[PDB]
Structure 1
Amino acid sequence: PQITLWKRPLVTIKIGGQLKEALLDTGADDTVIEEMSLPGRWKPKMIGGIGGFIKVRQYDQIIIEIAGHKAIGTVLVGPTPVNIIGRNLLTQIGATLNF
């Protein structure tokens, strides 16, 4: 699809057996999801943006279905105010910004 930017570019994702809404975010290096459990190993990380930093858990090799398209990569889990699909997964679904 061609997604407009007149509104937030929100899509449905499936992660850890759960459906969630998330923002397609070209400004995000990494994918960040609100608190949830995921299986496997994790390690702590700090990520920063407007307003400063939050502590997250870094889970590697997580599959996420994004608007119907599967992709695997690292997912950060923590107290983000919005679920964010970042570049690490946007590349894997072939997303581009066009103008």
Structure 2
Amino acid sequence: PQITLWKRPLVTIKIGGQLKEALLDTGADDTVIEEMSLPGRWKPKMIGGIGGFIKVRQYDQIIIEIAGHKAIGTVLVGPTPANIIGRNLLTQIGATLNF
């Protein structure tokens, strides 16, 4: 779809078989999801944002559906203020910014 920006660009995702709400976030390099149980191996990592750094679990090669579009890639799981879909997955679904 074409998504205008008067409202937050919130979509439904499916991850680990579970539906969640997430924000399409062109300012995020990486995808960061709130704490949840997720099948797969993970590695400890840190990620920084506007306010500093947090600890996350890095899950590689996770299947995620984003507004009906399939991606398979890295998801960081940790205490984020919001579920954010970053460029690592937005590129997989063919998203571009246009003006």
Q: CA deviation at 1:66?
A: 0.3
What TM-score do the two structures reach when normalised by structure 1?
0.97
Secondary structure of residue in 2 paired with 1:82: coil
Please identify, of 35-44 and 56-65, the stretch whose mean Cα deviation from structure 2 is larger: 35-44
Q: CA deviation at 1:73?
A: 0.2
The residue number in structure 2 matching 1:37 is 37
Give, in whole Å, the separation in 2 of the partners of 1:52 and 1:77: 16
Q: CA deviation at 1:37?
A: 1.2
1:57-89 C-alpha deviation (Å, 9 max, x unpaired): 000010000000011000000000100000000
Matched positions, count: 99
Q: CA deviation at 1:38?
A: 1.2
Give, in whole Å, the separation in 2 of the partners of 1:6 and 1:93: 22
Give, in whole Å, the separation in 2 of the partners of 1:96 and 1:70: 16
What TM-score do the two structures reach when normalised by structure 2?
0.97
Q: CA deviation at 1:32?
A: 0.4
Q: CA deviation at 1:49?
A: 1.1
- Which consecutive unaligned segments of at least 5 residues does structure 2 have? none
Q: CA deviation at 1:40?
A: 1.9
Give, in whole Å, the separation in 2 of the partners of 1:49 and 1:31: 12
Secondary structure of residue in 2 paired with 1:88: helix
Runs of 4+ in 1 over 2 A off after TM superposition: none
Give, in whole Å, the separation in 1 of the partners of 2:26 and 2:10: 12
1:23-75 C-alpha deviation (Å, 9 max, x unpaired): 00001011000001111211111111111111000000100000000110000
The residue number in structure 2 matching 1:79 is 79
- Which consecutive unaligned segments of at least 5 residues does structure 1 have? none
Give, in whole Å, the separation in 1 of the partners of 2:29 and 2:66: 16
Q: CA RMSD in A?
A: 0.6
